[PDB]
Design an enzyme around this catalytic site. Structure first.
Site, PDB file in Angstrom:
ATOM      1  N   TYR A  88      -9.531  -0.440  -3.110  1.00 17.74           N
ATOM      2  CA  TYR A  88     -10.573  -0.189  -2.124  1.00 17.74           C
ATOM      3  C   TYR A  88     -11.931  -0.358  -2.804  1.00 17.74           C
ATOM      4  O   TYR A  88     -12.289   0.436  -3.680  1.00 17.74           O
ATOM      5  CB  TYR A  88     -10.455   1.205  -1.527  1.00 17.74           C
ATOM      6  CG  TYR A  88      -9.158   1.373  -0.787  1.00 17.74           C
ATOM      7  CD1 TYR A  88      -7.969   1.655  -1.474  1.00 17.74           C
ATOM      8  CD2 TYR A  88      -9.093   1.208   0.600  1.00 17.74           C
ATOM      9  CE1 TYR A  88      -6.750   1.805  -0.794  1.00 17.74           C
ATOM     10  CE2 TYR A  88      -7.880   1.348   1.286  1.00 17.74           C
ATOM     11  CZ  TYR A  88      -6.719   1.643   0.590  1.00 17.74           C
ATOM     12  OH  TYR A  88      -5.536   1.774   1.276  1.00 17.74           O
TER      13      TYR A  88
ATOM     14  N   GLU B 122      -0.579  10.493   5.390  1.00 14.21           N
ATOM     15  CA  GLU B 122       0.008   9.219   4.989  1.00 14.21           C
ATOM     16  C   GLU B 122       1.138   8.813   5.920  1.00 14.21           C
ATOM     17  O   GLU B 122       1.763   9.643   6.619  1.00 14.21           O
ATOM     18  CB  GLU B 122       0.530   9.320   3.553  1.00 14.21           C
ATOM     19  CG  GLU B 122      -0.604   9.799   2.611  1.00 14.21           C
ATOM     20  CD  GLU B 122      -1.750   8.810   2.607  1.00 14.21           C
ATOM     21  OE1 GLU B 122      -2.880   9.248   2.923  1.00 14.21           O
ATOM     22  OE2 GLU B 122      -1.512   7.592   2.287  1.00 14.21           O
TER      23      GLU B 122
ATOM     24  N   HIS C   4      -6.406  11.258   8.571  1.00 12.18           N
ATOM     25  CA  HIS C   4      -5.018  10.821   8.628  1.00 12.18           C
ATOM     26  C   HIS C   4      -4.196  11.633   7.644  1.00 12.18           C
ATOM     27  O   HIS C   4      -4.726  12.218   6.689  1.00 12.18           O
ATOM     28  CB  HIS C   4      -4.890   9.306   8.303  1.00 12.18           C
ATOM     29  CG  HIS C   4      -5.214   8.983   6.870  1.00 12.18           C
ATOM     30  ND1 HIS C   4      -6.508   8.945   6.384  1.00 12.18           N
ATOM     31  CD2 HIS C   4      -4.403   8.766   5.803  1.00 12.18           C
ATOM     32  CE1 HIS C   4      -6.477   8.698   5.085  1.00 12.18           C
ATOM     33  NE2 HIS C   4      -5.211   8.569   4.710  1.00 12.18           N
TER      34      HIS C   4
ATOM     35  N   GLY D 262       0.767  -1.207   0.000  1.00 11.13           N
ATOM     36  CA  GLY D 262       0.000   0.000   0.000  1.00 11.13           C
ATOM     37  C   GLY D 262       0.807   1.270   0.000  1.00 11.13           C
ATOM     38  O   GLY D 262       0.255   2.333  -0.262  1.00 11.13           O
TER      39      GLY D 262
ATOM     40  N   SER E 218      -4.941   3.075  -4.865  1.00  4.26           N
ATOM     41  CA  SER E 218      -4.149   4.054  -4.118  1.00  4.26           C
ATOM     42  C   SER E 218      -2.752   3.555  -3.809  1.00  4.26           C
ATOM     43  O   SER E 218      -2.528   2.347  -3.640  1.00  4.26           O
ATOM     44  CB  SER E 218      -4.859   4.355  -2.768  1.00  4.26           C
ATOM     45  OG  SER E 218      -4.244   5.393  -2.035  1.00  4.26           O
TER      46      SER E 218
HETATM   47 NI    NI Z   1      -4.756   8.623   2.708  1.00  4.09          NI
END
Ligand code: NI
Ligand code: NI
Ligand SMILES: [Zn+2]
Length: 349
Positions: free
Chosen positions: A174, A187, A185, A167, A285
């Site tokens: 997703y 990263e 959040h 990831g 992602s």
């Molecule tokens: Ni994110």
């Protein structure tokens, strides 16, 4: 001057031509030269002729190994999300559940109405999110903005040490349904991220400018006093949801945007973001970097309670790109201060 560009720190959208699109790291530098990073989140609409995959009618048997039932608990705009792992299922099985009457998108007019319904019903009828699936839906010969191989300096981790982090320098899919969430959040290692919505219903986002992330953190430590005691960076657990009405009530600058199928979203270093899916969809992602990220990597405040294990060694980056500060940094005396308004050096063009 950097302070002069995008001074409102509002989410910008870009429509590159195919020529601008072909060089990924370069277009990121361009959008930064326009101030896009100050919002923490940017939209990029790719050229209409560009497609990362021919069709998505051939993935019904792809396996979602660890779908997550999202139980949200809270009130007055403040919530904690608990994960319940469910047995593996196919995309076909997941779509059927997503579209069933029990889970499907409710009726609405404006996005503003759907947004109110999300924040009102977040803690009811816990949905299942098909999250953190290792894989890619890009066809193998797509060379532009291929999330599997972006060719940024994040590649130095694997190239020098062989380390892959799922990831982070590999892609995650997703699979969304209505009311599935991603909590507030930044990263891991305060990296950038790229997020492409392959198909399906929209994904809505909230973002806080990196230059105001400390304010959001202050608010969160206040409202979740327990979590703050147990970990120096408890937001990295990705369990904390905060409504936009709560952000407004306490003066946290933020912006909102909805991502539609076929659009990219870019998040920037130390850009806090959260959001939710409108209905059945699939996004892909991963993380990436630029030279400007290095200083954020050095300064990232990491989860102390071992709940979030991701740590990248910065030494390679400081040695290659900051040779004049290496020795100082190793002695703990590199007092460099980040100016969040500055674009990455590759943008000087
Ligand atoms: Ni994110
Ligand atoms: Ni400001
Ligand atoms: Zn922690």
């Amino acid at each position: 001057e950097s302070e002069t560009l995008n001074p409102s720190a509002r989410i910008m959208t870009f429509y590159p031509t195919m020529e601008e699109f072909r060089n990924f790291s370069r277009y990121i530098a361009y959008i930064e030269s326009q101030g896009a990073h100050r919002a923490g989140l940017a939209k990029v609409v790719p050229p209409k002729e560009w497609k990362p995959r021919a069709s998505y009618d051939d993935i019904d048997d792809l396996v979602i190994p660890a779908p997550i039932q999202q139980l949200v608990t809270g009130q007055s705009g403040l919530f904690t999300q608990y994960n319940i792992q469910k047995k593996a299922m196919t995309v076909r099985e997941f779509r059927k559940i997503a579209n069933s009457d029990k889970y499907c998108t409710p009726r609405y007019s404006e996005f503003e109405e759907l947004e109110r319904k999300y924040w009102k019903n977040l803690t009811f009828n816990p949905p299942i999110y098909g999250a953190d699936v290792n894989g890619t839906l890009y066809e193998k010969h797509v060379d532009e903005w291929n999330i599997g191989r972006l060719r940024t300096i994040l590649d130095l981790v694997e190239k020098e040490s062989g380390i892959t982090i799922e990831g982070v320098n590999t892609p995650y899919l997703y699979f969304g349904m209505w009311k599935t969430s991603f909590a507030w959040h930044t990263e891991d290692m305060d990296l950038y991220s790229i997020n492409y919505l392959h198909f399906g219903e929209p994904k809505s986002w909230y973002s806080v400018p990196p230059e105001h992330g400390k304010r959001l953190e202050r608010l969160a430590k206040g409202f979740f006093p327990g979590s703050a005691q147990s970990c120096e960076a408890f937001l990295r657990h990705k369990m904390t949801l905060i409504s936009p009405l709560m952000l407004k009530k306490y003066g946290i600058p933020f912006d909102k945007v909805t991502q539609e199928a076929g659009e990219f979203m870019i998040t920037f270093p130390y850009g806090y973001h959260a959001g939710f899916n409108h209905g059945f969809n699939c996004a892909e992602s991963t993380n990436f970097a630029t030279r400007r990220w290095i200083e954020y990597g050095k300064q990232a405040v990491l989860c102390s309670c071992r709940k979030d294990m991701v740590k990248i060694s910065m030494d390679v980056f400081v040695r290659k790109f900051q040779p004049e500060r290496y020795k100082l940094w190793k002695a703990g005396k590199d007092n460099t201060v980040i100016d969040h308004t500055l674009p990455t050096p590759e943008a000087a063009e």
